[PDB]
Design a protein around this ligand. Structure first.
Ligand SMILES: Nc1nc2c(ncn2[C@@H]2O[C@H](COP(=O)(O)OP(=O)(O)NP(=O)(O)O)[C@@H](O)[C@H]2O)c(=O)[nH]1
Ligand SMILES: [Mg+2]
Lengths: 123, 208, 1011
């Protein structure tokens, strides 16, 4: 499973989108628990998200300190950001992600946690 | 360990959307009729190792049928799709089954009633009985709400492997690389990003 | 690569190259597979590809290539057979027949190329459907003769006969004309006597498996239609029920034949046939008991192990026992020597009813419903099945599924996100049988439930599953006990369930028992009515659950509140003995404390429950006061946000103010839903201000779209503002749909509503128009459309042309607008047709264009209304009589409606509306042949009748749209279609015959004389 050398920092239900710049539209990528996992050895935190029933990975990347969360025009409960190395679907790809939550409260809490975890990887 | 799966049913029943949901996780709202067949590989992780389904998503529209029953040759399992909001698609289930078992005489077959997420349901659960005499497994599914969307493949994997205790397991999570952004294009990580930022997310009225 | 060379037909077909393209498609992957796919389709779709099928069958070393060659022949035989010269038809027949014999006599190819023979047999049957027997009268005799020369040829002849029986009897209704299917039907019935000889001989002597199985598989198809004497006046029943049940390689197909035998309604007066029907059931059950499994076997564990074909056999066994017993169990209930067989058969079903398999349980549950319903009415029967029913009560109670009302489900105990319509239907089916089983013995049912509840108190058998199934079973049998027995019963259950909740602590445990308490009490309102102390304690516990952290417990408490109150509202409005005031007055006062922890949409559910109670009060003054006491908090907040919003009109910028406004109108919608016409005083208190707010919100929406663009419609701010407009329209629509005082609606409500919504809809950009406007007008036209004929005209002018322009460029843009648009045009054309007579002739052309546009939708919500509007429009025009508008209509649109109806009937893309399409075309055709159109429909020699010009028009229209039809095909079809224009069943049959003939060449025009 390759999650035993890791500790869970944050868990929240969410829906993940990837931006198809060609078609200029958001495409769903997965619904499930979004987790912040801090490797106990190297202390770097990653985002790991699995789809609900099949448990396949839809997000797998370090919460790099260079990332910035921006709002999406149509939602007060979502965040948009760019990701240069995500290995959910195999080889490391680049993606513009959007993640939506059940409430603005969960979305603000995620941004708090997302930024706390950035301070961890900046060492 | 790969198995050929043919996917048949009337046009518009949701065959292509159901497969796309399993390949990428997306929900396609447009109806672009499949032309002949589209083969996609689809791998599931089980407690008995990975299993790969070579999914032959055929065309339901007669004018786009392609080779028709020629797609069924050497298939090892099958899914028959119909639309619970369309009585016609269920009256054609015996026809798709007829063409299928004349070529595939002894394979596991799932009967799926799609679009159970729509309030105005036309094919009531009480009238869906065709699978009984034909030894098909039946599932109410929805590629939109993901209701029972994993059970067609879970049942087939249990019949193809021969292990009724087979379960889906979490695929391992390899360590993700540490990479810095590209300042050669980081001045342009603001065009295709502000575009995505101003393209509204779909279905904002959902729970997620 | 260069795989396209096979598509060139000038040069010769490189058979080798073909075999590689085929191998690349089936065995390859990726682009080379897709490249080979498009090439094979184009090769197959070539009208001349069939001429190369001869050399593919000889010179190809690939079975898949010979398969596709037959797929090419199958297209030719099915569609263009009767156009070939007679020499090509004999050549293809001899070629197919010779190849089949060639593949059967090679013992090795007969084993390894099974499909290629099966595809060949099906192809031969396609020839039989065209040529036999009128041009092949010796096929069956020669087939029977060739059966003895080779055992492989004999087995394959059973496949050809099986496929021939399927195509003629099972799949002919939709693929042949009525005369063709009847012709091929009589042809097989004439020759079946000689087909049964061969089949019976092959079963009586029997070689080994393969030939027997293929014989039985073919017999399974015969049993659909063959006369009964072939089954009972021979010895084949003894062969099926004994010999072929012992060998497991013929056991499955034999069980399916005996199921088909079991499903015929015998001459229920013949003692002999009854004796044979008992006999094959007696033999079959004997073979299962000694050769398969005994009656005590754990079929639940055998099905779960999934060895070999165990699951398929137990499915087939359940189907056999249920089919036979549902039709013939009465043959075993009187004779005492058959009692053990009758009960052993049902005991097998009890064991089959313990299998964990949803769809197999619904099959056996269906039979249990058939049984207990019969025992409930038929005298002297229930005592036979006393032990079967006692076992069945235990099975159903332990396998109860979750009803609708239970919103708590285990993932972890979380809230239900999706309704499970399949689970809900299974629960209702289980409740039906368990209610019957309770009536059959209420003492046994109560003891089973009381004993199980005791072992939840004990903790002896505690679990979430066991407390849920028990609680669900207890609520399902509501109404089956006597009020006295029910009184003692539910007082117990409720007391123990409350004791269970107060005992076990836990976020999950206390939520599971809460949902079980709430389901049981919601199902027993009769008990709650006659015991106020219980009802009050129940209601207060629901209020206690409205403060729990789990939203599902809160959600269910509000829904259980509404469910109890819908039945017991009388006991909340009167002054109860030993009480200070009506309980409604107490609830209204604490309404801020009771709903303090509820989320908005659950607070509105609370208010709707209060409105149910208040509407019980019939004293107008007291009810109007109870209504005011209820609406104080939303009216207080409404008065505030109205004072400082007419002044300070920007204030509507605040997102938090938008949420407050929407929830206020949502609370007014909730109360108006339950009270209906009794809501008028509260509606009048806010109506004139609400419509101004609608105007105020409307201007900001248009302001944001101008300042930000169309993207503003997606922002949370605008979406929040539009919610206020949607909720206002929903409140107006809700009241007008339930209003009894239509005079106040017309004189007070209609004129400020149309002023506030109509031009705002017409003058907003398309992306800003709320489809709920159209939905609101439909209710207005439906309920008071006959009193505002000038209001209906105004409604049309504001919405008709601009909405039609949004939805006439494709079939998918603005989906909610299409549905409400045609719902609006339907009710206007129905209850106010005069508004269309007031349309300018150009706007009436768009109205007809809008109707035929709805024909061609595959969306049923639009397609059904479009065919209905056209039907009602024709009736409306006919009612006017012989006036200019009615004659101008038929001149300009009668053939637009006849042709556009024929287009959707024959384009193979609107099969879902065939019935309403046929009904419309029949009405149109009947107009002319009843001389209801008093003008010439042509602008043709004068004096000719509209009956004549209609037949010339339709014959010309069909000759151009279907050029492959002979003139006499079109002549006979229209002739029959005309004679039958008052007989919808035959009319629809002639149409279905026509849709068969337009798919092939050479259809017999005499087929249209079937009636
Ligand atoms: N409401 C709803 N719509 C669905 C669902 N599944 C598919 N659809 C929709 O139905 C339409 C048909 O899509 P599609 O997958 O192409 O069906 P198909 O059977 O592959 N058509 P064809 O056989 O001609 O290729 C799409 O618009 C899709 O969004 C569903 O589960 N719920
Ligand atoms: Mg498709």
């Amino acid at each position: 499973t390759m999650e035993e050398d890791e500790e869970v920092l944050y868990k929240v239900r969410a829906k993940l989108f990837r931006f198809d710049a060609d078609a200029k539209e958001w495409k769903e990528r997965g619904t499930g628990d979004c987790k912040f996992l801090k490797n106990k050895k190297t202390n770097k935190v990653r985002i790991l998200m699995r789809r609900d029933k099949t448990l396949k990975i839809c997000a797998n990347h370090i919460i790099a300190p260079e990332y910035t969360l921006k709002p999406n025009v149509g939602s007060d409960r979502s965040w948009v950001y760019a990701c240069t190395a995500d290995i959910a679907e195999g080889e490391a790809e680049a993606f513009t992600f959007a993640i939506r939550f059940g409430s603005k409260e969960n979305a603000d809490k995620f941004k708090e946690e997302f930024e706390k975890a950035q301070e961890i990887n900046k060492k | 360990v790969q198995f050929k799966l043919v996917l048949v049913g009337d046009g518009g029943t949701g065959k292509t959307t159901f497969v796309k949901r399993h390949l990428t996780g997306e929900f396609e709202k447009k109806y672009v009729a499949t032309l002949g067949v589209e083969v996609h590989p689809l791998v599931f992780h089980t407690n008995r190792g990975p299993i790969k389904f070579n999914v032959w998503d055929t065309a339901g529209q007669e004018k786009f049928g392609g080779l028709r029953d020629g797609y069924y040759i050497q298939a090892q399992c099958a899914i028959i799709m119909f639309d619970v909001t369309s009585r016609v698609t269920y009256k054609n289930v015996p026809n798709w089954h007829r063409d299928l078992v004349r070529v595939c005489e002894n394979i596991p077959i799932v009967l799926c009633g799609n679009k159970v997420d729509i309030k105005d349901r036309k094919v009531k659960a009480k009238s869906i009985v065709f699978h009984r005499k034909k030894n098909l497994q039946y599932y109410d599914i929805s590629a939109k709400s993901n209701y029972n969307f994993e059970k067609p493949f879970l049942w087939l994997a249990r019949k193809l492997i021969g292990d009724p205790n087979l379960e889906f397991v979490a695929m391992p999570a390899l360590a993700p690389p540490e990479v810095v952004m590209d300042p050669a294009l980081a001045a342009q990580y603001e065009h295709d990003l502000e575009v995505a930022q101003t393209t509204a997310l779909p279905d904002e009225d959902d729970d997620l | 690569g260069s795989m396209e060379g096979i598509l060139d037909f000038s040069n010769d077909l490189d058979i080798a190259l073909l075999d590689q393209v085929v191998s690349t498609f089936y065995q390859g992957s990726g682009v080379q597979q897709k490249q080979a796919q498009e090439i094979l389709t184009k090769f197959q779709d070539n009208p001349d590809a069939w001429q190369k099928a001869d050399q593919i069958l000889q010179f190809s070393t690939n079975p898949q290539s010979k398969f596709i060659a037959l797929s090419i022949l199958d297209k030719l035989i099915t569609r263009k057979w009767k156009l070939l010269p007679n020499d090509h038809r004999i050549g293809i027949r001899n070629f197919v027949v010779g190849m089949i014999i060639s593949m059967c006599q090679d013992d090795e190819v007969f084993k390894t190329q099974k499909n290629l023979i099966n595809k060949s047999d099906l192809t031969l049957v396609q020839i039989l459907k065209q040529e036999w027997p009128q041009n092949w009268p010796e096929f069956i005799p020669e087939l029977i003769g060739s059966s003895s020369s080779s055992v492989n040829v004999c087995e394959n002849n059973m496949i050809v006969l099986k496929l021939l029986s399927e195509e003629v009897f099972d799949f002919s209704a939709e693929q042949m004309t009525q005369a063709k299917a009847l012709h091929l039907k009589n042809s097989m019935s004439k020759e079946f006597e000689q087909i049964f000889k061969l089949c019976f001989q092959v079963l009586e002597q029997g070689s080994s498996s393969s030939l027997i199985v293929a014989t039985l598989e073919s017999l399974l198809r015969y049993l659909h239609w063959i006369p009964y004497r072939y089954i009972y006046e021979t010895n084949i029943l003894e062969l099926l029920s004994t010999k072929f049940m012992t060998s497991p390689d013929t056991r499955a197909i034999t069980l399916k034949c005996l199921t088909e035998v079991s499903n015929l309604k015998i001459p229920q007066d013949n003692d002999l046939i009854k004796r044979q029907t008992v006999l094959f059931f007696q033999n079959t059950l004997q073979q299962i008991a000694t050769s398969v499994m005994p009656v005590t076997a754990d079929l639940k564990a055998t099905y779960a192990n999934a060895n070999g074909n165990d699951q398929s056999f137990l499915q087939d066994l359940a189907m056999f026992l249920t089919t036979y017993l549902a039709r013939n169990r009465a043959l075993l209930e009187s004779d005492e020597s058959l009692r053990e067989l009758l009960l052993n058969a049902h005991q097998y079903l009890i064991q089959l009813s313990k299998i964990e398999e949803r769809e197999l349980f619904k099959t056996t549950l269906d039979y249990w419903h058939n049984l207990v319903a019969d025992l409930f009415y038929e005298p002297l029967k229930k005592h036979i099945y006393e032990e079967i029913c006692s076992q069945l009560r235990l099975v159903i109670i332990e396998n109860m599924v979750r009803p609708e009302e239970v919103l708590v489900v285990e993932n972890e105990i979380v809230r239900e996100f999706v309704k499970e319509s399949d689970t809900i239907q299974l629960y209702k089916s289980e409740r039906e049988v368990l209610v019957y089983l309770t009536h059959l013995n209420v003492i046994d049912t109560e003891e089973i439930m009381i004993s199980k509840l005791a072992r939840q108190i004990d903790g002896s058998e505690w679990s979430w599953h066991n407390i849920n199934t028990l609680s669900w079973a207890i609520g399902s049998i509501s109404g089956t006990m006597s009020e006295d027995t029910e009184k003692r019963f539910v007082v117990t259950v409720i007391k123990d369930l409350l004791g269970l909740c107060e005992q076990k602590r836990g976020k999950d445990n206390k939520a599971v028992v809460a949902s079980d308490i709430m389901y049981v009490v919601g199902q027993y309102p009769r008990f709650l009515k006659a015991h106020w102390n219980f009802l009050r304690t129940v209601i207060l516990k629901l209020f206690e659950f409205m403060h729990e952290t789990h939203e599902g417990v809160q959600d269910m408490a509000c829904d259980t509140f509404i469910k109890i109150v819908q039945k017991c509202k009388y006991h909340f409005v009167i002054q109860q003995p030993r009480e200070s005031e009506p309980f409604i007055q107490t609830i209204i006062r604490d309404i801020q404390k009771t709903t303090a922890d509820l989320q908005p949409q659950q607070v509105h559910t609370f208010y709707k429950a209060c409105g149910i109670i208040i509407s019980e009060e019939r004293s107008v003054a007291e009810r109007n006061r109870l209504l005011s006491d209820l609406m104080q908090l939303p009216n207080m907040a409404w008065d505030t946000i109205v004072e400082q919003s007419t002044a300070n009109p920007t204030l509507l910028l605040d997102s938090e103010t938008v949420k407050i406004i929407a929830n206020i109108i949502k609370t007014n919608v909730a109360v108006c839903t339950s009270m209906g016409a009794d809501f008028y005083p509260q509606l009048g208190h806010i109506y004139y201000n609400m419509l101004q707010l609608y105007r105020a919100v409307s201007s900001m929406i248009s302001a944001q779209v101008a300042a930000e663009g169309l993207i503003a419609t997606k922002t949370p701010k605008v979406r929040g503002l539009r919610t206020i407009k949607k909720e206002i329209l929903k409140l107006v629509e809700t009241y007008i749909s339930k209003a009894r005082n239509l005079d106040d609606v017309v004189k007070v409500l209609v004129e400020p509503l149309l002023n506030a919504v109509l031009e705002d809809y017409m003058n907003n950009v398309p992306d800003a128009r709320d489809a709920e406007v159209l939905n609101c007008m439909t209710t207005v036209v439906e309920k008071v459309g006959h009193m505002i004929p000038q209001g209906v005209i105004l409604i049309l002018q504001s919405v008709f042309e601009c909405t039609l322009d949004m939805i006439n460029k494709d079939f998918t843009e603005y989906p909610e607008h299409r549905v409400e648009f045609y719902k609006l045009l339907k009710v206007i054309n129905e209850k106010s047709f005069a508004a269309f007579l007031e349309l300018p002739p150009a706007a009436f052309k768009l109205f007809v264009d809008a109707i035929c546009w709805a024909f061609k939708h595959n969306n049923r919500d639009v397609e059904v209304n479009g065919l209905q509007i056209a039907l009602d429009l024709v009736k409306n025009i006919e009612r006017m009589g012989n006036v200019p508008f009615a004659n101008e209509f038929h001149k300009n649109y009668f053939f637009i409606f006849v042709s556009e109806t024929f287009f959707v009937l024959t384009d193979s893309d609107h099969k879902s509306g065939f019935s309403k399409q046929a009904l419309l075309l029949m009405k149109l055709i009947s107009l002319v042949y009843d001389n209801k159109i008093s003008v010439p429909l042509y602008q043709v020699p004068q004096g000719t009748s509209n009956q004549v010009y209609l037949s010339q028009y339709l014959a010309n229209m069909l000759s151009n749209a279907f050029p492959h039809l002979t003139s006499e095909q079109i002549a006979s079809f229209l002739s029959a279609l005309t004679k039958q224009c008052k007989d919808l069943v035959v009319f629809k049959g002639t149409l279905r015959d026509f849709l068969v003939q337009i798919k092939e060449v050479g259809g017999d025009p005499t087929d249209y004389l079937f009636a």
